[PDB]
Amino acid sequence: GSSVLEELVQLVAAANIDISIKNRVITDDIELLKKILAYFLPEDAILKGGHDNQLQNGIKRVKEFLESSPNTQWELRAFMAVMHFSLTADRIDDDILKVIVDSMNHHGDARSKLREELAELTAELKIYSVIQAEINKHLSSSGTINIHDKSINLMDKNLYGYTDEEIFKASAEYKILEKMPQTTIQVDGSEKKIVSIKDFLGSENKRTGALGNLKNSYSYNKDSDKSRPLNDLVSQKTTQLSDITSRFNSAIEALNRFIQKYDSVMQRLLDD
């Protein structure tokens, strides 16, 4: 009981942080800190696992957060976000936590920073789903997909739900697309500039990793040890993006559960 809490509190001294509320500074008030923890993490809430092992796992992650962050100044709520989201049944992955934690420590808005990151990811994913459906179609109809000079233009607002060019430019989709290189083509009569499937996929300027040696056309077996087809390469990227996206999306209700829990532990401890 009391011992796990003693262990966590000591964790602020091992890390060289000050914790303030937020305008009380409270790092040295060891009795307050423990009450806050006591109030916010019921005993049977802090996970142990059968062998304990989970508590070791949780303290390890708490410790990791405290030495990773650049801030010596921790806002109390961010500190409690780490505890909540590392030690309990409601734990989330390190990436979402860093997003939440950092913006809390710079007195920003964790909820919007999370939605925003979620939007960047959803944008990328939408663009990949376009590539995916384009790749399938060309194999399905003619056996060959060109991603270079005859690519769909990915820089096209109507691919993403937008009906007005200007609004598209404020989009997460557009911010990504405009970091991409472009390729000169001739469709009908005139010169036009596009963001080819190849331009996007070969880029380092997105979350997902670049594909390194993309050819201009992928075909069905025309005539080894050679690696994967285009459709399989982009299939893998879209699946890992799709997992990250579902986690960040779940983090939203999680964040809300914690904000209301935290707002109702601050309220209950602004008396004693």
UniProtKB/Swiss-Prot annotation:
Any matching Pfam family: LcrV
InterPro entries in the record: LowCa_resp_V_Ag (IPR005413), Vir_assoc_V_ag_sf (IPR036139)
Q: Where in the cell is it found?
A: Secreted
Q: Write the protein's name.
A: Virulence-associated V antigen
Q: Which UniProt keywords apply?
A: Plasmid, Secreted, Virulence
| Gene name of this polypeptide | lcrV
Q: Name any GO cellular component annotation.
A: extracellular region
* Function (record text): Possibly involved in calcium regulation of YOP expression, which includes the export process.
